Amino acid sequence: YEHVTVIPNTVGVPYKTLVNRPGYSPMVLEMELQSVTLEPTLSLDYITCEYKTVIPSPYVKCCGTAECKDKSLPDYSCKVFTGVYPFMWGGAYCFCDAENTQLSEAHVEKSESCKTEFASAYRAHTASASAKLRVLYQGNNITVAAYANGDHAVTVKDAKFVVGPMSSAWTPFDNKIVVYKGDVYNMDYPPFGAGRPGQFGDIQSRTPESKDVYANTQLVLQRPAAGTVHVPYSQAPSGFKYWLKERGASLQHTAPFGCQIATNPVRAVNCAVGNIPISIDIPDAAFTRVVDAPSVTDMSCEVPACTHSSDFGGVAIIKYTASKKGKCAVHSMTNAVTIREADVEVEGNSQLQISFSTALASAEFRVQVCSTQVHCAAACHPPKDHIVNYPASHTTLGVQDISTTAMSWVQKITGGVGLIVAVAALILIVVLCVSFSRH
Amino acid sequence: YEHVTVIPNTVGVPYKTLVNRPGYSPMVLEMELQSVTLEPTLSLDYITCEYKTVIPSPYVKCCGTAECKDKSLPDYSCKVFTGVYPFMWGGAYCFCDAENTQLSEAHVEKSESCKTEFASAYRAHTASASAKLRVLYQGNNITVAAYANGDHAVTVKDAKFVVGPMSSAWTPFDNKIVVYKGDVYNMDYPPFGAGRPGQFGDIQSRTPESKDVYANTQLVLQRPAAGTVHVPYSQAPSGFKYWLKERGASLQHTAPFGCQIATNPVRAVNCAVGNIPISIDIPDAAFTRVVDAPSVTDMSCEVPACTHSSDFGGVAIIKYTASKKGKCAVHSMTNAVTIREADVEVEGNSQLQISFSTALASAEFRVQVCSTQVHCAAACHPPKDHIVNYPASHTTLGVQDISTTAMSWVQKITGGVGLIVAVAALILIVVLCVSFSRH
Ligand SMILES: *[C@@H]1O[C@H](CO)[C@@H](O)[C@H](O)[C@H]1NC(C)=O
Ligand SMILES: *[C@@H]1O[C@H](CO)[C@@H](O)[C@H](O)[C@H]1NC(C)=O
Ligand SMILES: *[C@@H]1O[C@H](CO)[C@@H](O)[C@H](O)[C@H]1NC(C)=O
Ligand SMILES: *[C@@H]1O[C@H](CO)[C@@H](O)[C@H](O)[C@H]1NC(C)=O
């Protein structure tokens, strides 16, 4: 037997559904959603880290001319200076006091620490979805897990379950994301091979194990100070450290709809969007014939209390006469009132007690117990507590939900006004006809 | 200095573009596209292979009653038969002649061969693209390779190249594909856990190394024959072998646009759709000043032959006087005529020879040689060969492209008819004016 239902995407709230098959007693199922997860598909682009500067010992040539050649190393620079006269701790180094030169050079390499301290950029694509459910079936709790689409099915206790697809494709991730030790940021990083001297992306490589490194820092050699041997230079500071000090709030704290974020692997969970259809296949052996179930012949209802708070603040007592001992199901016949208890045991001549919640200021509803129905009514009072720590268990109201006292006042005024118009209209009709016929 | 061009997505055809910078001599570049590759993103769903049936020795209990219990193994079946009287080579087995029973059972397992002979299903997502180019630059051939989007650049001989994005998103793959040893098919395979007894997907698993196996075959035990010991059964044949004998043609033979396919990894090659923009950055050192290049003062043109075939069927001779020896670039000033030669050498007083192709029945064009212009004209004859083995090297013609003889005939006929109308109008006007004034 095929049954189809729809459940809204709310975590931590039970829902009930009624199964009705001709010739058999009705059955009621209860379901609760525990978790929903989305998972995107990623592709790596490049990584960044710190740089190192390498400077060899200088070469000083006095009373001769020095020169140097070009090299293929990254950010290579070479310059020759004239007029030097270096000193050491023991006196002047060379005999010649004029026509001296000095040669200096430097280049840039990748830091050893990049194996541990680094950041990576990813390109994002369409995400998948999965869900986990609890089902109350034949008085026992069972669990299922499945992908949230139509291409998967599971079987538990000879019942088949299919879930999905989801009604919405909203995703909290952009096309370009950056991940660093548990944080995810939305950032439009610069193209590969087009970096900047003082921002994110000054050093680029494809993978931590590669040898090919790109750099776009500035490096200029300067004239040495008189009497000292050293190699001064000017260079722009590393951009990676600058980012760490100003990167700001992470995606976890700013995302809408209450989503939570994880990074290993990247995930987003419990996003409160849309609804999820469900389909169940129930085997024939689960049903009991109407000739075997007990019958109930007489009912009455009273309601001693009602407060329309967010919780189960209502109680009702129903009297019954049963023909024999057995089990019976209970279900509400309205949408504005929910009943907590799923079933009862009936015997002889006695009474049963149930609890309910509702938002109505004046409540009227019907309750069905083993194929018969009873009418209940009561008035409800407001609560006193301004703020609570949990969501409500009931649906919202519409324009039709009005107190019976207010409805009476509306009818009286509208009727009265209509009567004045109706009488005046009749007078005009009579006068016109008399004039017509007299002429 | 930036230069932006567009080249159509056709493999094996050269194209030329003109770079013109005030103060410097013009430069001509030539480019050719060698290959384009598309690569989709895949995820694995399930695999299929062959099945095995396991049957242990039967147990026979004569003049006693056998029984058996249920087990959790896939497709487990158990039955008891009465009234057996087995024989063996040496005589009847048991002393009792009546009240004998036999117990039989079987179950289904996964074949050992599944490690080598199997098929896999994938879900497809948005593909990436890459390209390989040849460039003629500074008189030498260089090559580049890049991703076909705006997020990548390369540097060769101090020139920067950016290629892409593509103008079209057409992809030859569907959402669901199946791959088997080099063949790719589009197939809507059944969902997991919902197979059929005689079709593709009767046995399913998640990965070749899994222990969890699903099967939906039929297996029924039958009564044994009199006087023998055996275990007959009825079972549906394997669906996997049926597919292999009936799978039909693969995408490589049926796909549109002439696309080629490879499977390791899955790729589509040389699909002829759309066009590709390109941007180049040329350094200043490559340019030569107009004061240093030679000048040409006198030009003439003679064209001894032209046949407008698909190949280069035209020849022209140009006369020149040059101020000094040097290099010179040539370029066509029209769209309907393409010139094969990119550069010439000029010295003294001499002549040069060029070749061209066009579809025009009557050709007229200008040629630029070192910043001067020469005018050429000719009539062309048709070819005699019906079919060739290569695409044309020239553009198509429009409605305005008409031979000079036909144009003269059209003008004469239209002019004559128009003159007759003009005269008749004048006569009518004068007569009407006379009547107006006289009345
Ligand atoms: C731990 O160290 C390994 C290398 O030894 C590195 O790959 C990894 O990112 C480190 N993890 C953390 C949390 O620092
Ligand atoms: C298990 O079922 C019982 C009813 O017999 C119910 O009270 C309980 O909440 C269920 N367990 C969970 C975790 O919901
Ligand atoms: C070769 O055999 C291995 C297993 O031994 C299998 O995984 C692979 O697909 C085979 N390749 C071909 C081309 O048959
Ligand atoms: C390579 O350059 C030469 C000129 O030096 C040219 O003739 C040749 O056609 C080029 N190669 C290709 C494949 O076009």
UniProtKB/Swiss-Prot annotation, chains A, B:
Highest taxon of source: Viruses
Localization terms from the record: Virion membrane; Host cell membrane
Membrane-related topology note: Single-pass type I membrane protein
Residue positions bearing lipid (S-palmitoyl cysteine): 433
Glycosylation sites: 141, 270
Biological role: Class II viral fusion protein. Fusion activity is inactive as long as E1 is bound to E2 in mature virion. After virus attachment to target cell via host MXRA8 and endocytosis, acidification of the endosome induce dissociation of E1/E2 heterodimer and concomitant trimerization of the E1 subunits. This E1 trimer is fusion active, and promotes release of viral nucleocapsid in cytoplasm after endosome and viral membrane fusion. Efficient fusion requires the presence of cholesterol and sphingolipid in the target membrane.
Protein name (database record): Spike glycoprotein E1
Residue window of the full protein shown: 810 to 1248 of 1248
